[PDB]
Amino acid sequence: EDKKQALLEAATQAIAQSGIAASTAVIARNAGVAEGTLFRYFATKDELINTLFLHLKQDLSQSMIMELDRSITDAKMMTRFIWNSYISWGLNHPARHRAIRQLAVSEKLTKETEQRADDMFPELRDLSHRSVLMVFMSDEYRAFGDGLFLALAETTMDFAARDPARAGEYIALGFEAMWRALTREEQAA
Amino acid sequence: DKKQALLEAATQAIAQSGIAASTAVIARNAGVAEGTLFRYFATKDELINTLFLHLKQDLSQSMIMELDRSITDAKMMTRFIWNSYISWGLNHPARHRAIRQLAVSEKLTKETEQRADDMFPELRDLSHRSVLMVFMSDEYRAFGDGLFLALAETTMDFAARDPARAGEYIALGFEAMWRALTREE
């Protein structure tokens, strides 16, 4: 498994730098195993993509479970906790964030992986904290939704990293911006 | 002109590698050694600012073309503005990527910021009206633009990857940016 894990870390780095296009040969060389070993563990580029999205999401969920709390809590409290966890994770593990973002907006994630990934987070039970637009987006435009979220989260991380004196402000502003985006609803004449 | 070839090469270089892009290759790909480039622009900072302005002027041209002024809803106006911006980015990806890098650089003089405000006065007024104050402030204007350009680039990337649904992506992205960034009732 030692070998498989080194491969996952190498794929993370490769995709972080070059996206889904990253070569299987380069991943294997940067693991220090020939490309055949790689295709033994993962039988396809797709199977690897999916396994890596899940491995990375598990890593995220691990960093959170330390401070995980009960569902009877404000949806904004829970969502801010998730967002702060994510930002901390991306700052500590930039390649992990970059890779996972690439994976998320790939059109390559099986529904099985999507269900496993929902089930890493009991928290993804919307309970209409979301607006009507975004519940509609979750059905029809889920990748675009995640894309937008990760865009806001990455902008947050980049500014925090560039100017940590203001990190908390940025994390706050970014959070509110995504929260309004996710939660604010139509106001009519 | 020669200057224009330099600016277009600088756009391409920054689109690819950000502000770090070397003056040497910008000059090389313009077809001139570095001294010529430094003749036209005496600093990287001066070049950064001059290019931000050249690019914003291009954007402002492409937007002001399509504007009709009978419209007065601020969400209507901003939605058309965003359609124009998304169009420009789709048509000129290097120009968008570069302008985004330049915008969130901490390298833009206040003179450059006001000249660029004054390319589209109507958009600056639109923005003081509609945008939250934090994202408009002196201290967090850059973060606001960062968020905006993030959403705009995600919109562009999805539209480009899947043009059959481009309008859907442009609409949704707009709403997301609007709700995120703008003051409420």
Residue numbers in the entry:
A (entry chain A): 7 to 195
B (entry chain B): 8 to 192
Reproduce text from the manuscript describing this model.
RamR is originally a transcriptional regulator from Salmonella typhimurium, which itself has no inherent catalytic function. Here, we report that a designer boron enzyme based on the transcriptional regulator protein RamR enables the kinetic resolution of hydroxyl thioesters by a boron-catalyzed hydroxide transfer reaction assisted by a nearby lysine residue. We incorporated a boron-containing amino acid into the protein scaffold RamR to create an active enzyme for the kinetic resolution of α-hydroxythioesters. We found that a closely positioned lysine residue is crucial for the catalytic activity of the designer enzyme by forming a hybrid catalytic dyad with the boronic acid residue.
